[PDB]
A paper describes a structure:
Stx2a holotoxin is a ribosome-inactivating protein (RIP), which belongs to a family of AB5 toxins, consisting of a monomeric A subunit (Stx2A) and a pentameric B subunit (Stx2B).
Here, the state-of-the-art instrumentation and multiple software processing platforms were used to determine a 4.1 Å cryo-EM structure of the 72 kDa Stx2a in complex with the ribosomal P-stalk, with local resolutions in the range of 3.5 to 7.5 Å. The structure reveals the presence of a density associated with Stx2a in the region identified earlier as the binding site for the CTD. The CTD-binding pocket is located on the opposite side of the Stx2a surface than the active site, and it is formed by α-helices: A, F, I, and loop 1 spanning residues Pro27–Ser39. Importantly, the cryo-EM structure reveals novel previously unidentified amino acids, involved in binding to the CTD, namely Gln10, Gln11, and Val14. The cryo-EM structure reveals a part of this loop spanning residues Cys241–His243 and Ser256–Cys260.
Numbering used by the authors:
A (entry chain A): 1 to 242, 258 to 297
B (entry chain C), E (entry chain B), F (entry chain E), G (entry chain F): 1 to 70
C (entry chain P): 6 to 11
D (entry chain D): 1 to 57, 59 to 70
Write the structure that this text describes.
């Protein structure tokens, strides 16, 4: 439904994010460390989406606050963006099924696929610098910019905005490592390769988490967890299983040697065949 | 057209190394060795298997074994 | 008082 | 100029020792068998892979790139 | 004529190119290389394994192994 | 000493039964063929890898590699 | 008495089919390449490797190995 995100301060932004999860996701008893606890997205009807207004970017005074993001609940994928100043709505090409009635919907050629966004940005998803003045410039460009595609400047705008929204909600590192950027020093955030790898493996990590029972050693793809704190801080929201989760592998998690191995990770390199025949010679 | 499209249960590997697999209640024997790890990986992960043949009774000729991601 | 966790 | 790129959404094999992938709308096949673990492991984890052949215009492929993105 | 059934938590590769497997508290040996690329997999997957052989007496080698997911 | 270290995310197998690995913007080639399963396992398993050689000239080949958990 | 036991922290490949492993801070190298791939199973699965030997002096060919867990 209607929502708003405040970038004014660390406490405000964190509280807004926690409100988003609390009103969206349900905490998991199996993973329940008192107040802090990962949560699972509550099942929602298909085609539903919430709306969040961007606020707190301009902390000096009320200004530059006419942007909204509409995001579905089914798999937590960016659906579209609304310019309230122009009272217009742009929808991702791959999100044609998702539409917002009551606003002037406008088709956008670009899709929401990560590969397309990286290509148009022409920059690796690790290493971008996000700052308040850069955020304001991107905001103003998008407000004045329009049409059927996002330009390269709009490419930075969209990648920066999606970075601070999707993984920020999904994962607890970004909010922890982006709050300082709001500080008086306001250090400029840098997207590290580890966070990129965690983002890429969101689906399988979320599929693995539900059967977690306070284990210590988790091993899923490029991702490994060796302590409870890391598990807590990695992901805060997971996909829904009922039966979209079950697509590859009857069970994705193997609890062996007090270790949770992803089934795909083990099966990938566990396929050695007859190979000494080469060394036998002609 | 598809003789058996289901999860492979197991195979018999006798001293002669004959690979007598059986799926969906149908026993089919093959004599290949490089497919042993490929099939065991499918088995352990619950991966399904599809086998085709003109005569789909056990002990008949076989020419198409595959795994269906979808 | 968000501790090191936050 | 790529013969194919993506994932192994669906594949096929034959007893004549030829394996193929249904990708980019075509059943790209190859007769070699020294790289079977590579692509099968790649699809097992869903990590992206691209394959080139003698030409990327019903033939055999022997050169493969694999990325984790 | 199953000789042993269950799970294995360790396996030996003796220096004479012989590989021995511990199942339900007893060791059975063989020399068939094809087992190492596959049997080791069972060690990391809880993959139930049973053994049939002509003689199951203590220290007898093993040639036929049946793998069940269970 | 250590020619390079870190993560592996890109590499090409050539028609001539040779394999090249991309690390630290420096392609290391080798005709060695018994290490490709190790390389793919490490790449997909999140296993840090580093290559050391006496002569690590620009794009120097790779034949002495070691692993790292972190 | 036991001399090398622990989780592998350094595994090194040499072109002469000799593979070295650091266990308990001791380097043991095996020339028999047959065991080179198998160790990979314990390499990523955290299966601590323990090596038998008459004496604790290292650098000798090692082929008596065991995999366990803590």
């Amino acid at each position: 439904r209607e929502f708003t995100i405040d970038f004014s301060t660390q406490q405000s932004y964190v509280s807004s994010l926690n409100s988003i999860r609390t009103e969206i996701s349900t905490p998991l008893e199996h993973i329940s460390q008192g107040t802090t606890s990962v949560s699972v997205i509550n099942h929602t009807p298909p085609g539903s989406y919430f709306a969040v207004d961007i606020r707190g970017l301009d902390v000096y005074q009320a200004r530059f606050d006419h942007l909204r993001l509409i995001i579905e609940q089914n798999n937590l994928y960016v659906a579209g963006f609304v310019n309230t100043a122009t009272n217009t709505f742009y929808r991702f090409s791959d999100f044609t099924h998702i539409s917002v009635p009551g606003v002037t919907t406008v088709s956008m050629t670009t899709d929401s696929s990560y590969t397309t966004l990286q290509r148009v940005a022409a920059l690796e998803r690790s290493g971008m610098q996000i700052s308040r003045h850069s955020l304001v410039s991107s905001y103003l460009a998008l407000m004045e910019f329009s049409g059927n595609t996002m330009t390269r400047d709009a490419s930075r705008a969209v990648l920066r905005f999606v970075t601070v929204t999707a993984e920020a909600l999904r994962f607890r590192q970004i909010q922890r490592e982006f709050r300082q950027a709001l500080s008086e020093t306001a250090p400029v955030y840098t997207m590290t390769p580890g966070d990129v790898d965690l983002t890429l493996n969101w689906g399988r990590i979320s599929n693995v988490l539900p059967e977690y029972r306070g284990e210590d050693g988790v091993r899923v793809g490029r991702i490994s967890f060796n302590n409870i704190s890391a598990i807590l801080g990695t992901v805060a929201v997971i996909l829904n299983c009922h039966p979209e989760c079950q697509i590859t592998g009857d069970r994705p998690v193997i609890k062996i040697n007090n270790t949770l191995w992803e089934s795909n990770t083990a099966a990938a390199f566990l396929n050695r065949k007859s190979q000494f025949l080469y060394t036998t010679g002609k | 057209a598809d003789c058996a499209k289901g999860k492979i249960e197991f195979s018999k590997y006798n001293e002669d190394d004959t690979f007598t697999v059986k799926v969906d209640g149908k026993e089919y024997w093959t004599s290949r060795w490089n497919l042993q790890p490929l099939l065991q990986s499918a088995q352990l992960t619950g991966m399904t298997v599809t086998i085709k043949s003109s005569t789909c009774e056990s002990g008949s000729g076989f020419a198409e074994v595959q795994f269906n991601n979808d | 008082g968000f501790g090191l966790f936050d």
